[PDB]
Amino acid sequence: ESHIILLIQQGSDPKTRIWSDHCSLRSAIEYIVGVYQTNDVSRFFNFFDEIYDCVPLVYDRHFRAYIPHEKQWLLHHAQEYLTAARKYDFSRHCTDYGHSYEWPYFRSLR
Amino acid sequence: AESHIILLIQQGSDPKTRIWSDHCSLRSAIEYIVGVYQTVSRFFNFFDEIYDCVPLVYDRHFRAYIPHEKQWLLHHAQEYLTKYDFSRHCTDYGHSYEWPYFRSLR
């Protein structure tokens, strides 16, 4: 029952907003990396830092609520993900579910 | 203040139509979702055509967002009343730096 939502805003204009939901932290990291690869590591963190706003929300099983984190929180996890391995399109793999009907919170209400 | 509401919106079946709005009060979220409709029995059909809408309501103590079903925003929009540009007034802030949670840890 892991669920992570990324509130992404590409530029200073809120018109560029898009959100992604994933079933695990690895899926969230693989998503944002796959977004950068729609066109190096250090150049990737250049791309990540250029994102105007990106606040992750992680779901808590017991409290049944989403914990907000800073943009730096996803930086640290993405950093250690890339160590163990050895126009941008933000809709690429931007969801592991078809509808919020499938999210862990809404399934528990049945 | 410490009141924040996030609307996770997906217009069509394709997740490319995803957009999220954040507001400082429940009234602002309702006024926003009404403002996008006008860009009144047809308002029900507009809101029902939205493929997915998850309101996230912030709790000041627990410092977490409470997920709600789409009907929770519909019912509050109904009380307020007694193609579409979902970017119109879609934020009461300029950055999440101004949100109540991120102001709380200062």
Numbering used by the authors:
A (entry chain B): 7 to 45, 55 to 101, 121 to 144
B (entry chain A): 6 to 44, 56 to 98, 121 to 144
Question: What did the publication describing this PDB structure actually write?
Answer:
Here, we present the co-crystal structure of Erh1 in complex with the amino-terminal domain of Mmi1. Our structure reveals that Mmi1 binds homodimers of Erh1 in a 2:2 stoichiometry, via a conserved molecular interface characteristic of ERH family proteins.
The co-crystal structure was resolved to 2.7 Å resolution by molecular replacement. When bound to Erh1, the carboxy-terminal residues of the Mmi195–122 peptide (109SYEWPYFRSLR119) folded into two consecutive helices, consisting of a 310 helix (H1) and an α-helix (H2). The Mmi1Trp112 aromatic ring stretched into a deep hydrophobic pocket formed by Erh1His9, Erh1Val70, Erh1Ile11, Erh1Leu13, and Erh1Trp25, with its Nε nitrogen forming a hydrogen bond with the side chain of Erh1Asp27. Indeed, Mmi1Trp112 is crucial for EMC formation as substitution with alanine disrupted Mmi1-Erh1 interaction as confirmed by GST pull-down assay and ITC. We also observed that the H1 helix toward the amino-terminus, Mmi1 (96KYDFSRHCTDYGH108), adopted a long structural loop conformation featuring several turns, which was constrained by an intertwined network of both intra- and inter-molecular interactions.
